[PDB]
Amino acid sequence: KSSMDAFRAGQAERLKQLSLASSGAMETLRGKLAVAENVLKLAELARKYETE
Amino acid sequence: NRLRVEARKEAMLAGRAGKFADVQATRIKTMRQLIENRKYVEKHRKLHKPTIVERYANYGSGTYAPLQREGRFPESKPLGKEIETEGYAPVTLKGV
Amino acid sequence: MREIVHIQGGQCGNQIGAKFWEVVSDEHGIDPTGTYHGDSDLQLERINVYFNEATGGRYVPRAILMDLEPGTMDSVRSGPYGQIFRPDNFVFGQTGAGNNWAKGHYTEGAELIDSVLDVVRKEAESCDCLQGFQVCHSLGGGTGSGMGTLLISKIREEYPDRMMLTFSVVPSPKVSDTVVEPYNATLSVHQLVENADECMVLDNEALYDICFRTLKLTTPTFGDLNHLISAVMSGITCCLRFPGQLNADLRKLAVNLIPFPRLHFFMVGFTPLTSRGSQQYRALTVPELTQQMWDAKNMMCAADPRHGRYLTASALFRGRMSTKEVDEQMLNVQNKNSSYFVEWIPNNVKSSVCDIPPKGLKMSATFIGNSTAIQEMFKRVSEQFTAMFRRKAFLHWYTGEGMDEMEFTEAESNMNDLVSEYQQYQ
Amino acid sequence: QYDVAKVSKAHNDLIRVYEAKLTEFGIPVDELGFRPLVT
């Protein structure tokens, strides 16, 4: 039973750390993408008043 | 009689190959419409909405060819509030 | 079979919907206690479009109230016919909308709209073969536009195969209620033109001009305005409840009206609207119901069609009439006013006839036009928007709740290109 | 202006070759969606 608990705890901890680090990375990447899409939208709106 | 029978058969088969010109297309059209409707089982018309980056990257290499069916015509002003600044630019060193 | 769920967003939408439900209950012949006390069976043949048999005749409406205060909810309960709605559908927060688009689309929306979707989804799955959605709201407030518009967007994403009728009380310049009406209207139409399928646009300016000229009322309180908007929303969809000589489903109306997927704002009126005094003298046959129908002063919108062109019109008649008479009416109207009509659409008018007139009246009609002169309201609201957006007035109440300038510019550009799309065809 | 004529004629020629390519398979019909502008 001690072996049981040790192994299961190890698996739980590794899942915890993977999920947390991955979530942080995705949040950073999504922030970058949001900045980029705001830039593209501003470019799209601005080029409306440009002459041919 | 043999020649007459064969002439009748060939003329009728040509007249029916005229009809088969209208079955081959109905095969390819149905195939093409079926390969695409298979991808709309998840989101039939919401998937048609792309992100701005995807939309810009898809058509050409940073362009967009709007189909005349949607009726969204922002690239062409109604000619009422048209813009042309070429005339205002100076042509002489005095203006410069 | 076919049915419509209804949602009443904000105070204006709630009161309009309450009057609408009173009108529908009167037409179908049911008591405020919920029991049926009508006269004929043609009405109870098709009540399942708006009502559900609860227990032994206690019919319950298929509508959901929605606001952020309990005062309006208490008012509608205390008012007549307010004792029929399901108490499980009186969803409402407590904090207060603050007439703020951010406060009704980003905080209280995020704190109550999961629940409002839960209840509306329960109703939409209780009903078997859906036909569409019906929503009532105003485009000049915070929870009228925020709450209702976010609900519209979520419902469109969740059931993207159901025709959607949103009835929008657009702000009118002379009746200026609050200070941020242009901001809210811009931020609301930005999402309506993108998600919702058709909005019937109404305005208090024309709703008062009608009452002063045609009705000849002395002191029209909001009761009469809500009565007119009701009588319009009741006749917008009658081919479902009652049989007709030439039926017209909601989807049929949409496909006949909307030529392009972005020109779906409908300007609407009702006939006959006869004053209490002159009605006893007035004559009511088809070739004057149609004349008042196309009368520019009967339109519930401060945009005279003589300032633009008609893309499509829809005339829904009610009562036993002559179809050939109706068709010759429409044809001669088009030939008389060819100039006001678009060239590349033959027979711009779609006509429908239903066999059951409303309560008391023997003939009735409803007009729904897609004229390109409706660009005037959007142009005016955009002008009022840009009058304030140059100086960022009243903008920190949205900036602090978390909206940038990018979406404001997006919404204004959306309005501008919509105006361009109307103007180009004309 | 001779260069302009060259590029315009080549534009028309590529419209021709592309419509020929589409019709040869026939998997789309001759025309779909948008309509190209002609100089």
Ligand SMILES: Nc1nc2c(ncn2[C@@H]2O[C@H](COP(=O)(O)OP(=O)(O)O)[C@@H](O)[C@H]2O)c(=O)[nH]1
């Ligand atoms: N037709 C009608 N309009 C109303 C009534 N009560 C209020 N209104 C309009 O609704 C507007 C108020 O907007 P409101 O609903 O408070 O915005 P919200 O708080 O975001 O929902 C005012 O400009 C009024 O003209 C009514 O009983 N009938």
